[PDB]
């Protein structure tokens, strides 16, 4: 039932801060409430200190807030072998302690980014260990995907490749969201040219609330975390589904919240609203989970799905007859009063896995190989105790996934 979240990295803590804000807010709980079922770990004291002096300061406990007052950096090697294996022992203890307190936890909710140092290396060994101790648990992660062009680090794809190489075998489902795509939605739909980091995180939090919080609540058609992976991942490899929302309308400029189920659902099948840069170029739908929260009529959902099924424009996988997971909840999508979201009585959470991920991987992998070809900042990894072998093995594993995805669909 319960799911302990493990937010790691600067962006991980930032996104978690916004995510947890909505969580307690939509539950009608004040900052000075209940006990948060999540932990925050990073390598920069300033990042964690911000939470210890910001909003919901007394909502969290210092025990679930590890502060690595030594070094942070932005390289996988450092945040994994050198200083990464320093606080891992304590971190594992903290989560295990909480897991002992909970009443039959379903698994852990990982929150991090594929780029950076702490959000890459730490997560890799964390999930590695977690899958060894709690292998009989659901491993759901929300790995923030680096933008295709808008990279924040020079070694961005140099870390992501390694992260997705090791954790790929110690993960069940990795919900990927493109940071650049967040700007797109905010510009195209929200029509805002001032998207602060908090705004980007708030949009994802809105999704998370509908994936865990509300879904864990009693509805018309409940869906457990076990049902998630059982339908989302048809293979042993940790697949990366996309997180798409429906009510992305602004609360000022546009005002048409009275949209039918056939409209909101149809909005989750467009590149303009997918929350990822994986445009539907050749991405065959192998699994698509539709989580409806709010005023939702069962028949309306069935009709909406059928309408898309016979659309033909959206090509599905050949061996996939009916890869649609239906989820109907009762509580509507809660929105922050001082925000940009219009706030509707119904929302649709589209979680689909397609062959479009291949294009994303192909770009990221290419960007990595090009740098690796000239060695690049490899010396900054070698000195941390990491050998060339690790990078090469990662490249080979990534290539396998590149072929794997194209072997799942495409061919009949």
């Amino acid at each position: 039932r319960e799911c302990i979240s493990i937010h790691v990295g600067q962006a991980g803590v930032q996104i978690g801060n916004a995510c947890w804000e909505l969580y307690c807010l939509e539950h009608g709980i004040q900052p000075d409430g209940h006990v948060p079922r999540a932990v925050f770990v990073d390598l920069e004291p300033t990042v964690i200190d911000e939470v210890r002096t910001g909003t919901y300061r007394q909502l969290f406990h210092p025990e679930q807030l590890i502060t690595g007052k030594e070094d942070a950096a932005n390289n996988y090697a450092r945040g994994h072998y050198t200083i990464g294996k320093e606080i891992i022992d304590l971190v594992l203890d903290r989560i295990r302690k909480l897991a002992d307190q909970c009443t039959g936890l379903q698994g852990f909710s990982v929150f991090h980014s594929f780029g950076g140092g702490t959000g890459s290396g730490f997560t890799s060994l964390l999930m590695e260990r977690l899958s060894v101790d709690y292998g009989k648990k659901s491993k759901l992660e929300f790995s923030i995907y680096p933008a295709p062009q808008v990279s924040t680090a020079v070694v961005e794809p140099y870390n992501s490749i390694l992260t997705t190489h090791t954790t790929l075998e110690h993960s069940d489902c990795a919900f990927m969201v493109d940071n650049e795509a967040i700007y797109d939605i905010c510009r195209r739909n929200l029509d805002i040219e001032r998207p602060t980091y908090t705004n980007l995180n708030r949009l994802i939090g809105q999704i998370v609330s509908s994936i865990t919080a509300s879904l864990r609540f009693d509805g018309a058609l409940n869906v457990d975390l076990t049902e998630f992976q059982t339908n989302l991942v048809p293979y042993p490899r940790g697949h990366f589904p996309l997180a798409t929302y429906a009510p992305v309308i602004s609360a000022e400029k546009a005002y048409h919240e009275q949209l039918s189920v056939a409209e909101i659902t149809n909005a989750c099948f467009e590149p303009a609203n997918q929350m990822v840069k994986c445009d539907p170029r050749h991405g065959k739908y192998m699994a698509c989970c539709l989580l409806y929260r709010g005023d939702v009529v069962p028949k309306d959902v069935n009709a909406a799905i059928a309408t898309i099924k016979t659309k033909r424009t959206i090509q599905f996988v050949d061996w996939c007859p009916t890869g649609f997971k239906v989820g109907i909840n009762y509580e509507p999508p809660t929105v922050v009063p001082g925000g940009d979201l219009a706030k509707v009585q119904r929302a649709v959470c589209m979680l689909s896995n397609t062959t479009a991920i291949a294009e994303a991987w192909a770009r990221l992998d290419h960007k990595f190989d090009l740098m690796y070809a000239k060695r690049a900042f490899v010396h900054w990894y070698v000195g941390e105790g990491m050998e060339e072998g690790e990078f090469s093995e990662a490249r080979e594993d990534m290539a396998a996934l590149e072929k794997d995805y194209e072997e799942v669909g495409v061919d009949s």
């Binding site: 950096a73 932005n74 924040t152 680090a153 700007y183 998207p195 090009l370 000239k374 060695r375 010396h379």
Partner: protein, 426 residues
């Protein structure tokens, strides 16, 4: 994240005097007072450069090393010279002669013993030591000479920690010391083999910036050092405060040097306008990048237009959206792709902090590593050999204690560095 500052040489002490006069305003600390900062955010990061002890008296970890007693004496009698502890005053009343060998093999060697003790004392303070900051000129006894031995022992003692050095480059048009190129060649030799981070500050470029971009008729040395000090604070200090994308020395160096050949960086400043007529408030976003990537904004004599941008670290400090920043940087890389390196996806590492330099709305510090900086080394190399072949003032070095081959050791190394750069330029 504690950092210790060390000033070597007359020039180093003069620059440091300005740095600790500007950074004090950044943290809001009175000369011999306490925390008088406007806000409270500055207090949560004072341990980075200041050390706790008396409580009210926040002392700055800045060791002063110079063979010229007069230099340190003028600083200790200044408006901010009483904040320095007698412990940090590592003076040596010896031959302050402008000679590398003198401040390294003879007079410098004996004074280093005391320096090593003080540096160890300051390094074992609290929290976690990040690295060291050194200010020195490539044309002085204690500057280039002592600065060399200083960093050599520092890196040998703590090779785990980083080294952020500020190298004062001799003006190409009109140098100060006649033995400047000789000293510069010897300093750059150990620099590329010891320090990891080094910024190039030109003496003539400093005059140009304050003459064309600024409305300063007479750019005094203090004014020149002011500009540099106000720039360095936006690198180290600014990267210690909370913001959209918090960075750090490691986050910078590990995202700036593609190769372990040191790689010198060229500084710059976007909001470089006068207080009068230039107060147009033109600091939305495109104006920042426009001036940051300007050939006449470079703190170095060399222009990156003649070379290729290997890696650029853009550190912004103020309230701004990630969209307007990153998107603008992309436009720059796409428009100036001709010299932005095609073997690297993104060469501009963005960083946005949420704290401007007090009386400012928007600001951005420029730090770029370009292959065009080879023109600088080529200049020193040409100057060196020109007088080296004739052995102009070589006797001044041999008189103190220097090897005839030692001269070539530094020359061959500096020349080899230029080669490495040019190879990757084309």
């Amino acid at each position: 994240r504690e950092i210790v500052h060390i000033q070597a040489g007359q020039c180093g002490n003069q620059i440091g005097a300005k740095f600790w006069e500007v950074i004090s305003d950044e943290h809001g600390i009175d000369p011999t007072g306490s925390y008088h900062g406007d806000s409270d955010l500055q207090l949560e990061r004072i341990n980075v450069y200041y050390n706790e002890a008396a409580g009210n008296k926040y002392v700055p970890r800045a060791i002063l090393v110079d063979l010229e007693p007069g230099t340190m004496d003028s600083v200790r009698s200044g408006p901010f010279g009483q904040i320095f502890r007698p412990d940090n005053f590592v003076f040596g009343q010896s031959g302050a002669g402008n000679n590398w060998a003198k401040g390294h093999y003879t007079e410098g060697a004996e004074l280093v013993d005391s320096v090593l003790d003080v540096v160890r004392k300051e390094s074992e303070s609290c929290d976690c030591l990040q690295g060291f900051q050194l200010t020195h000129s490539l044309g002085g006894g204690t500057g280039s000479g002592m600065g060399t031995l200083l960093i050599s022992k520092i890196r040998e003692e703590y090779p785990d920690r980083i080294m952020n050095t500020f190298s004062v480059v001799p003006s190409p048009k009109v140098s100060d010391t006649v033995v400047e190129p000789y000293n510069a060649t010897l300093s750059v030799h150990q620099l590329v083999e010891n320090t990891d981070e080094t910024y190039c500050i030109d003496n003539e470029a400093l005059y140009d910036i304050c003459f064309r971009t600024l409305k300063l008729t007479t750019p005094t040395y203090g004014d020149l050092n002011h500009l540099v000090s106000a720039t360095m604070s936006g690198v180290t200090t600014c990267l210690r405060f909370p913001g959209q994308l918090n960075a750090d020395l490691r986050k910078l160096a590990v995202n700036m040097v593609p190769f372990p050949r040191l790689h010198f960086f060229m500084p710059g400043f976007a909001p470089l306008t006068s207080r009068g007529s230039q107060q147009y408030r033109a600091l939305t976003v495109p104006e920042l990048t426009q001036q940051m990537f300007d050939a006449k904004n470079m703190m170095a004599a060399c222009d990156p237009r003649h070379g290729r941008y290997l890696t650029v670290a853009a550190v912004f400090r103020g309230r701004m959206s990630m969209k307007e920043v990153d998107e603008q940087m992309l436009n720059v890389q796409n428009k100036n792709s001709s010299y932005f390196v095609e073997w690297i996806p993104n060469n501009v590492k963005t960083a946005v902090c949420d704290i401007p330099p007090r009386g400012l709305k928007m600001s951005a510090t420029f730090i770029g590593n370009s292959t065009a900086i080879q023109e600088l080394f080529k200049r020193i190399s040409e100057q060196f050999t020109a007088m080296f072949r004739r052995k102009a003032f070589l006797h001044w070095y041999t008189g103190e204690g220097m090897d005839e081959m030692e001269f070539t050791e530094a020359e061959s190394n500096m020349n080899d560095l230029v080669s490495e750069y040019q190879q990757y330029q084309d």
